[PDB]
Amino acid sequence: SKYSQDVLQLLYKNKPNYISGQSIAESLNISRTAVKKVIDQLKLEGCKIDSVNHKGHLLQQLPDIWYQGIIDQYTKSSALFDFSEVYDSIDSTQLAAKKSLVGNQSSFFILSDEQTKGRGRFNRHWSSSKGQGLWMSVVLRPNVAFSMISKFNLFIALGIRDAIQHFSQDEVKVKWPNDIYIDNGKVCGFLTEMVANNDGIEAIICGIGINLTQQLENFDESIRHRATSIQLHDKNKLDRYQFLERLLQEIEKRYNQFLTLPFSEIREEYIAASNIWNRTLLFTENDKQFKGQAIDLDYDGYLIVRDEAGESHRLISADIDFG
Numbered sequence: 001s002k003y004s005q006d007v008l009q010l011l012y013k014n015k016p017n018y019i020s021g022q023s024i025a026e027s028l029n030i031s032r033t034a035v036k037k038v039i040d041q042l043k044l045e046g047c048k049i050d051s052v053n054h055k056g057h058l059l060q061q062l063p064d065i066w067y068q069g070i071i072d073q074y075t076k077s078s079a080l081f082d083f084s085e086v087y088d089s090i091d092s093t094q095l096a097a098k099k100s101l102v103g104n105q106s107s108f109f110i111l112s113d114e115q116t117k118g119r120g121r122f123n124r125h126w127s128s129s130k131g132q133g134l135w136m137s138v139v140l141r142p143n144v145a146f147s148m149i150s151k152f153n154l155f156i157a158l159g160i161r162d163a164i165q166h167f168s169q170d171e172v173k174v175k176w177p178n179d180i181y182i183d184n185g186k187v188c189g190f191l192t193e194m195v196a197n198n199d200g201i202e203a204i205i206c207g208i209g210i211n212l213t214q215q216l217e218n219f220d221e222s223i224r225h226r227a228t229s230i231q232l233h234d235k236n237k238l239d240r241y242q243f244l245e246r247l248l249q250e251i252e253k254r255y256n257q258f259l260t261l262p263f264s265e266i267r268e269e270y271i272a273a274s275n276i277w278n279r280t281l282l283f284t285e286n287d288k289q290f291k292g293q294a295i296d297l298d299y300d301g302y303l304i305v306r307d308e309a310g311e312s313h314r315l316i317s318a319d320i321d322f323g
């Protein structure tokens with residue numbers, strides 16, 4: 001309905017108190033009977049709303065669906081983000097973000113319950129199941145040189161890891177430079193892109209995909225053994241709204257660190273949170289592949305690699321597989 005988001009927002013704003021049907025009706029200038037119809041539909045979509053005679057309605061729990069009216073509250077109180085766009089389905093939040101950033105200096109994020117053309121690094125297919133993951137693109141406006149893209153990627157990794165770690169009883173680790181793992185399971189892939197020229201960055205677009213509630217059966221058999229979800233490591237129901245709130249918190253925290261701190265001030269923290277050490281790694285580099293060991297991460301965020309032949313490498317980025 002036309003007023004479903006408006007009603008949902010009123011319910012959300014008024015927690016933990018009940019709000020009467022009459023008061024919603026007056027707030028939105030619609031009838032009591034249209035308020036009731038909207039609320040029945042919200043409950044049908046899986047909103048847990050307690051309704052009590054003479055008292056009104058209390059929103060108790062939201063379903064695994066993104067609602068614009070709720071997310072609007074997140075951006076209203078955000079010092080970072082001007083707005084969000086929320087979709088049930090699109091080709092890709094990253095395509096959408098890249099179109100929406102043109103011609104303005106707004107900071108914003110784009111969420112979709114489902115992506116039909118999710119793409120990771122090297123245009124690889126990213127599986128984006130409806131109602132099972134956070135598929136999001138974040139657009140930010142750092143006033144910095146284009147070479148700073150690499151350090152942004154390192155800072156944001158730690159924020160995403162921290163947000164996920166709050167909900168996982170199991171160790172969450174970063175694989176440099178672009179993924180998050182729980183044990184052998186990839187729980188998140190992110191990538192950082194930019195629009196830029198020699199005078200500076202016009203926008204950062206960080207595309208973030210986080211598996212929230214997949215069971216193992218919900219991953220294609222080709223990736224099942226290398227994929228996992230937060231829910232598979234959380235004894236409690238993962239609430240996607242609680243999680244998003246924590247994720248935006250950490251993104252903002254790490255973005256402000258990115259603007260103010262050298263990478264050397266988080267380099268040790270990064271190293272202790274990574275899962276690339278003390279193991280043979282497989283590198284892909286255009287048409288050639290080689291094996292090696294990660295020796296160090298230097299003050300600039302470059303990986304120091306000693307390959308199979310004993311030769312050292314210093315890498316701004318790499319395409320790394322475990323085995």
Ligand SMILES: Nc1ncnc2c1ncn2CCCCNS(=O)(=O)NC(=O)NCCCC[C@@H]1SC[C@@H]2NC(=O)N[C@@H]21
Nearest residue numbers: 092094118119120121126127136189190207208209227
């Ligand atoms: N759901 C899943 N979970 C675990 N594994 C899966 C999987 N789907 C496929 N695979 C195996 C294949 C991985 C190959 N990619 S990677 O090179 O290893 N790293 C990587 O791509 N990072 C960046 C990912 C960017 C996704 C976000 S989403 C929102 C935004 N909009 C969009 O379009 N992109 C971005």
